[PDB]
Amino acid sequence: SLGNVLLVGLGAVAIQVALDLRRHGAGRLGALNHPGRRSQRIAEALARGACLQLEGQGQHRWLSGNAALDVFHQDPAELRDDWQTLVLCVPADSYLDVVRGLPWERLGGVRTLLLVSAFIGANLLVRSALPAGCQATVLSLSSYYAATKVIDETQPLRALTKAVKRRVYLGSSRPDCPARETWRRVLAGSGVEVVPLATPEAAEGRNVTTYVHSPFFLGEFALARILSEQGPPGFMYKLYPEGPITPGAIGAMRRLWCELSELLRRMGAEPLNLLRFLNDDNYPVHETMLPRASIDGFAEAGAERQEYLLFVRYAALLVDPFSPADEQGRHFDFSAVPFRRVSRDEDGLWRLPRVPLEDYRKLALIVALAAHFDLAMPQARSLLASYENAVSRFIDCQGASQCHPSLYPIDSRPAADAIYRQWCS
Amino acid sequence: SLGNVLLVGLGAVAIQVALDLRRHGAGRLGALNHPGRRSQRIAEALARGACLQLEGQGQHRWLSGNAALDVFHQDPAELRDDWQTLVLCVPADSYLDVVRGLPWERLGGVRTLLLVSAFIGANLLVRSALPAGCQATVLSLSSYYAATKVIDETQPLRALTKAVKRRVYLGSSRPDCPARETWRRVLAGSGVEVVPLATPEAAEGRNVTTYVHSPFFLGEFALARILSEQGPPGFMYKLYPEGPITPGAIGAMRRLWCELSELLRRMGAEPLNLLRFLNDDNYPVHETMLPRASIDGFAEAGAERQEYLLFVRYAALLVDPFSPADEQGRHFDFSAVPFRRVSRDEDGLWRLPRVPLEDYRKLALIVALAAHFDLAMPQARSLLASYENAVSRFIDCQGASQCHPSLYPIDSRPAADAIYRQWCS
């Protein structure tokens, strides 16, 4: 049912996906990776006999396996009409560009396009770039279902998965789509539970980083760490002054969740119970910190209780409460995830890490889209402004000539308009 | 003047107080401590020429000094009518025993008696135990004004002070009492502001330990650590599962503060703003964690907001947010105070540590007193019952034969009746 599968963007995600596809059963496996150093390293490794190699860490060792790459391309114009399924394993900010760059008028054999990390509107954005009469079904996965990295860029096709998510969601541009079940089974081989939902936006609306990264890593504290050069980087999930979590950040989280939930309703998607989603889909805590009744009742609890509960959740996860205690009674320091910070690239230009650049770009699109539904998203706009002000001051200080253009101002209104047009179609 | 001053109890508190008294000066300084291993070590140290030594830790190093003791008694029979001021540095739950045991027939010259760590009703209880026609004024200090420990009990006269309160409160059984100003000056020598209040109970209602230890260390989690032998002891101010602080513990804190505040009103004393008291008088946090407007408005904020704010306060103090950051951006682990646990005494009998035996005995007396004001104090009673159940099960398991009688049910009603009769006189 998968046929021959083309992986677009041959990185960590694609290597995990490739092994899951091979466990399930598929035809030929191809990849498209745009030009660059990574593609050069891949092409030499393949010439020397390399295959895609996945290692599962620790209790995920059973994931480990090898898979042959049958075809490798860098240039979309060079694709033959030999692919039934495309899997987009590139950054989600690149989905539109990827789709616009493919020669769809001679890819009539493509039946399915899977978006692995679909933001709100991604399915619609992708469909707006397809030619009229294109028969491809577009699938939206709520987020990548694991934690995977290419360990060593010198062995470019060897990836390590260190964790697998509990649950993700899958929606389709085709009503009551059958490709959902096939991909539900494929990804279930990794241990993740895939929950099919009735529309793409219902799955896109269950992208966790939209709700968590936006309030915490677009605020003043996080940006000060991220843009800093000297001193310790600070910690992503600790409380102030060690990390960015404050009652104000939790208030931003609640208000943004309200804003996102109303957008989802206006797009025809049921929103989520934030506290239950975080506890049950991501990381749980004990009943004495978050009682089950408080978790299940969160959406009706009232703003003060909701903020208290969210603050309790993140305080309860400063350590992993289910980890073994050490001889001193301490639990694993779960919150001590260091901030990645700005770094100069090979051209000497300052670049931002994916946290927060990808998070800012996603939220900028969501706000622009929401405007079409007559939703102002003031909390979201405040977070966008915080990022923009901080990055602008960094450019002022370092000099535009020293900064990569991804730091410069963007405009998401054209993509938002394309999404809205597609949705009204 | 203070005249000649007799310290009753010569432990960590007494050593700090002795330093402050010697700075102020002008009297003989004596001490009385009941017989036992500590008194034996004290007499040995003094006989070899030792003096009282107070060291300040870190920021408090400026306080460090030495204080000479003129006389030390471990036999009240040797006391004569030489003393104008008595300073009770014994545990607050022993005040009644200690006042009954003093040789009052040879102490007719005593003009003032200071309770260094009072609690609601302590002044009245002590006055009820004085001989008829005794005209010593009794002073109640709200809380001991520092954190002080005897470092090494083989050097019983050397103490370490690691914290000093910003503010404490002082009441007197004499209206418009002039001794309050004297003690204001004495304590000011170590940097503490003493605020005189118009009655003893107003000061006693500002005993910090009563508000904090009752909800946190009479609960299930704390008692399980305290009555354990084998585990790691856990930490007094950490969140579950490393420590006892949970939203339920915070709810108990809020509800007890309400109950205690009503008792204070019925005794003609103004209650406190719990959050402002904790932040401003004891240990502060940053405005981004506790905004000044939230602190000042706490008493009118409503139960949900009050509980959220108290939780945030204790989560913000898991580290000392004003301590210097280390190389990795971490602050001092302020909450890592280990629980002291049960231990066998020199007769082989299990004894409870002062946390929570002293805290239980204080709250039991307060509840018994409140019944005379027709206040049931259900939250306080739930905390008493939690302690009683846990200790009862420990006796069940270990055997009554093996337990010191201090672990057994007590009757606070006689002392509460004496307090109430004294108040009504």
Ligand SMILES: NC(=O)c1ccc[n+]([C@@H]2O[C@H](COP(=O)([O-])OP(=O)(O)OC[C@H]3O[C@@H](n4cnc5c(N)ncnc54)[C@H](OP(=O)(O)O)[C@@H]3O)[C@@H](O)[C@H]2O)c1
């Ligand atoms: N655990 C995870 O790995 C994880 C988890 C959650 C979310 N995500 C997100 O998933 C996305 C991919 O993650 P990843 O870890 O697989 O990244 P990766 O290892 O760097 O792989 C991305 C691959 O796609 C190539 N690429 C980028 N843009 C392309 C384009 N327009 N057309 C063709 N190829 C393109 C990249 O080549 P170049 O390097 O030359 O650009 C690279 O080979 C990222 O946005 C990531 O933030 C990943």
Ligand SMILES: NC(=O)c1ccc[n+]([C@@H]2O[C@H](COP(=O)([O-])OP(=O)(O)OC[C@H]3O[C@@H](n4cnc5c(N)ncnc54)[C@H](OP(=O)(O)O)[C@@H]3O)[C@@H](O)[C@H]2O)c1
């Ligand atoms: N930072 C602090 O130290 C601190 C903090 C908060 C509150 N407090 C309050 O201050 C009180 C004393 O604290 P501390 O640290 O000075 O204790 P400590 O170092 O143990 O000294 C207490 C002194 O009183 C004697 N004592 C104990 N129980 C007695 C009893 N039933 N009858 C007669 N004498 C007794 C003790 O001698 P033996 O050891 O021989 O009995 C010792 O000399 C605490 O109980 C508490 O009410 C102190």
Ligand SMILES: O=C(O)CC[C@H](N[C@@H](CCN[C@@H](Cc1cnc[nH]1)C(=O)O)C(=O)O)C(=O)O
């Ligand atoms: O967030 C990062 O960039 C890297 C950590 C990453 N986060 C998840 C979102 C959920 N984050 C936890 C908090 C937490 C995770 N680890 C310590 N604390 C929460 O919000 O409940 C993601 O990105 O999808 C992961 O869990 O692997």
Ligand SMILES: O=C(O)CC[C@H](N[C@@H](CCN[C@@H](Cc1cnc[nH]1)C(=O)O)C(=O)O)C(=O)O
């Ligand atoms: O045993 C220690 O070191 C502490 C001893 C002592 N405790 C006070 C109660 C207040 N406790 C702090 C919280 C805290 C203190 N130290 C770490 N956290 C708070 O509730 O605001 C007492 O016993 O009355 C002191 O702080 O002086």
